Amino acid sequence: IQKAIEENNNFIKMAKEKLAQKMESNKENREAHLAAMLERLQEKDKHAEEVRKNKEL
Amino acid sequence: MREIVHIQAGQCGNQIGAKFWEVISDEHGIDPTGSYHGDSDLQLERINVYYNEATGNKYVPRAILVDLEPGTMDSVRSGPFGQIFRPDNFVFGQSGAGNNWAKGHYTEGAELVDSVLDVVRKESESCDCLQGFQLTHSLGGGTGSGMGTLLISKIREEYPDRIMNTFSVMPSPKVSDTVVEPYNATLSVHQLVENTDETYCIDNEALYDICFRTLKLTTPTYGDLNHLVSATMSGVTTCLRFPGQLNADLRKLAVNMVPFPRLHFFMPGFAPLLTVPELTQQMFDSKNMMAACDPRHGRYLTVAAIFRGRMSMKEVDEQMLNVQNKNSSYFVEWIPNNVKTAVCDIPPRGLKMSATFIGNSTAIQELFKRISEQFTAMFRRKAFLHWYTGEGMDEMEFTEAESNMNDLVSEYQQYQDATA
Amino acid sequence: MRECISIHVGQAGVQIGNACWELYCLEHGIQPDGQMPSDKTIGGGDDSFNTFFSETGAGKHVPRAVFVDLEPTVIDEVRTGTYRQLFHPEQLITGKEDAANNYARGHYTIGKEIIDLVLDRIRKLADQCTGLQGFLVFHSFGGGTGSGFTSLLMERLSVDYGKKSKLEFSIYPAPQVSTAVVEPYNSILTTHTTLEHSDCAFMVDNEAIYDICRRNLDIERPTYTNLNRLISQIVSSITASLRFDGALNVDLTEFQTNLVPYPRIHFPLATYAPVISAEKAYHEQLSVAEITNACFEPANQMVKCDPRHGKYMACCLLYRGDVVPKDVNAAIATIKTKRSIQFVDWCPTGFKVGINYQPPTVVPGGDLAKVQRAVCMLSNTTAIAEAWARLDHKFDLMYAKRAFVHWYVGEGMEEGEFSEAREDMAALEKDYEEVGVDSV
Ligand SMILES: Nc1nc2c(ncn2[C@@H]2O[C@H](COP(=O)(O)OP(=O)(O)OP(=O)(O)O)[C@@H](O)[C@H]2O)c(=O)[nH]1
Ligand SMILES: Nc1nc2c(ncn2[C@@H]2O[C@H](COP(=O)(O)OP(=O)(O)O)[C@@H](O)[C@H]2O)c(=O)[nH]1
Ligand code: BEF
Ligand SMILES: [Ca+2]
Ligand SMILES: [Mg+2]
Ligand SMILES: [Mg+2]
């Protein structure tokens, strides 16, 4: 009976930890996906500021 | 997800936007005073997708009207349903780009983009669940082309997790003689390829070829062309505006239609231009396409079919299976069940039955090939640049746009030749 | 006691829940407002139907159910439909933005915003149970919520309730009523991550139910309403052992002992008879032998597969209505000497029989006829692996080109999860071949 308890508790434990990792790893990937597309959008703004200032020269 | 924010930029964008709002307004039973006078509750079911509910049960389009020239301000308000648009969603300049992509994207367009963005936010702030944006514009002009793409990349900064839709009208020497249109078109697709999720390719060369050769119009108006655009714009949005199961919102359509983020340029079709068999094969016919592309010169990645009117769904299901198995060679086998069909009970005004076709076909490369060919015929001569270099641009932007559009073509060809 | 809590996830799960709870109410004599004049004990009691219905002081019998969808459209119809008084508003959970046919959105981006609320409301149902038996989870394989949020939910239930039993009713995608091209993806993904957390899963192939409606019930073009009213009959046959009693009633968990030889081999094939129209059932009622013969006709299966080309590991017959053991044994004898039923060499060949005498009922305005006797067969056959093979092949066709995969990576998923899920399926297909080979 102590082995049955140990087994169920370890099943709960490892399921809790694999889900914790997946929800953290998924958040980091999604944020990096958005962080990449925004940093690439601001570089279009640097190229725009560099274009509209190159007109004066 | 419910509300769509609509933007119309430039002469074409505002014109095709007006007749789009006119058609769906009649379908949803809405007079120019924003009052409802229909008889089927299915018209008010998803009215919030395109209409706000104002004081007194009046419905105001969730529409934003933009143009660097204050020409279209009068025309829209003077045309039918001119009052229906809210006065504050009119933002206009005084001097336009003159068919100069740079003026609309970097200088006079960038001076005005902050103004329209303010109207986008207020319209988006009061959205229960903002679904995305749809833009109507030309790619061969100045404002809609240059400032339309700039507006897309600016909205995408503030709404990066929302769908960006565009109804992009492509230039054609058969309709417009302006010489700088292959330049404006290439610079635009260079932006659309990166910052939009769905683009309906409304090809002007197609629209004219239908008006002239099919409808037998010697000298068709812009209205004759726009009656086709309005017919299809209502068709492709039917699943968005009425209670349905398939492609009911912009994101679900995207997930169904776009297997690779850059290959998101659709080939819309419409029929007629009547039994279910005839509707089906006409809908899949080259002549009924709104992009100058023979679908049988390439292969279908995905297809969305929309039938409207009272008809036997059993017959529709059989005919859609019939056209697929008889033309299996034109559907990539590494995407199973890539043809989805929807049926809407209410038909468009004037017809008993209708069919609208949305196709992601590798044959769309023919459309981009024609533009790059007209682009390279002027870039090899280094012609008419000072209208673009004089606004601050450099050769890098032109050559980079050329490379990206040619990359889109080879990528459409790479998956056309793919096997199991 | 031994209460059972039902969880309905996504459109398919919710709309199937509507058909099931309506049928339950008709079977138990429960009115749309929850009143049951036959129940003479008010506010409580330990009757058989209390496994599925709790009771209030006002005499209302409340489904032990939770309806969850990441979009309000489908559940709004419940809030305003005929049985809106049956459910307390706290049982109908809704978001505002669905998963858009994306497993990643149902499991992560959108699902993680509502999962804590769902578990809280499930907890409040569990708190009213004196001896909770387990959960019944209804969901689609192909939808973004039915796939992604279900697996997230099943993972969390394993944590919150240990190895408390979790049974699934899973809608397997069919092209006739499919809504998304990426349904093969969501199917493989949800099956892989749920496999450890599910004790028994009844798969319902939409194409099998679609063909039965067209072939057996003169429906030229079946709708979800046609499919769901047929599905509820099968679900009813399976849960009838829990909601009714009788000297010959066999508890579902007792069938489950015979149906699951190994933890992963927990997908029984269901076949139901008779599916007959009122016009054909009139002046001709089918005997015990006739409906039992129909259980071995593949056209009456809930999943398209050929058991004749596989091996049996268990065969359960759940009878309903006017049925006595004498007729059953005679019908089984006729079949065993006239059908192709081969068993693996490591399990007995006897058929396990259960009889609930409460006759089946029809929903008013339905298509199927009211029969005096019905039967659902639950069989563990290696042939159900054919359903995995069909899905795994479609998965492979698209994934070899990474088609649509960017929609999942964009939401935070990695390619590794795709390949990891696919190889779990490969091993599952291989597990079904192993249990079929003879011993040495
Ligand atoms: N049998 C049956 N299948 C259904 C029903 N509704 C949807 N489906 C199937 O479910 C699959 C799609 O999943 P849905 O349940 O519609 O979508 P969902 O679970 O809400 O997921 P999202 O909408 O993406 O958030 C398709 O294969 C449909 O054919 C139904 O009422 N009955
Ligand atoms: N189909 C259609 N095309 C149009 C219309 N108006 C302009 N165009 C096309 O748009 C291009 C010119 O762009 P324009 O609308 O002037 O851009 P703008 O400067 O932003 O207004 C040409 O190739 C025209 O063929 C219209 O009403 N219908
Ligand atoms: F006519 Be557009 F403003 F170039
Ligand atoms: Ca009682
Ligand atoms: Mg203009
Ligand atoms: Mg849904």
Author numbering:
A (entry chain E): 83 to 139
B (entry chain D): 1 to 42, 45 to 275, 286 to 360, 369 to 440
C (entry chain C): 1 to 440
Q: Which passages does the manuscript contain on this structure?
A:
Tubulin exists in two different conformations related to its polymerization state: curved (depolymerized) and straight (assembled into MTs). The binding and hydrolysis of guanosine nucleotides rule the polymerization-depolymerization of tubulin through chemical-linked conformational stages.
Before setting crystallization plates, we incubated the GDP-T2R-TTL complexes with either BeF3- or AlFx (prepared in situ from mixtures of AlCl3 and HKF2 to avoid Al precipitation) to produce GDP-T2R-TTL-BeF3- and GDP-T2R-TTL-AlFx complexes, respectively. After several attempts, we found the BeF3- and AlF3 moieties at the E-site of chains D and B, respectively. The GDP-BeF3- structure (data collection and refinement statistics), shows the phosphate analogue in a tetrahedral state at a distance from the β-phosphate that is similar to the distance observed between the β- and γ-phosphate atoms in the GTP-bound state, and not further as expected for the transitional GDP•Pi state. The GDP-BeF3- complex is stabilized via hydrogen bonds and salt bridges contacts with loops T1, T4, T6 (GDP) and T3 and T4 (BeF3-). Importantly, loop T5 is in a ‘flipped-out’ conformation, leaving D179 exposed to the solvent and putting T180 closer to N101 in loop T3 in GTP-bound tubulin. Thus, our results suggest that BeF3- is a γ-phosphate analogue that mimics tubulin’s GTP-bound state in the curved conformation, and not a GDP•Pi or intermediate transition state of hydrolysis. In the presence of BeF3- GDP-tubulin activation occurred at analogue concentrations above 1 mM, suggesting a binding constant on the scale of mM. Thus, GDP-BeF3- behaves like a GTP-bound state with slower MT kinetics.
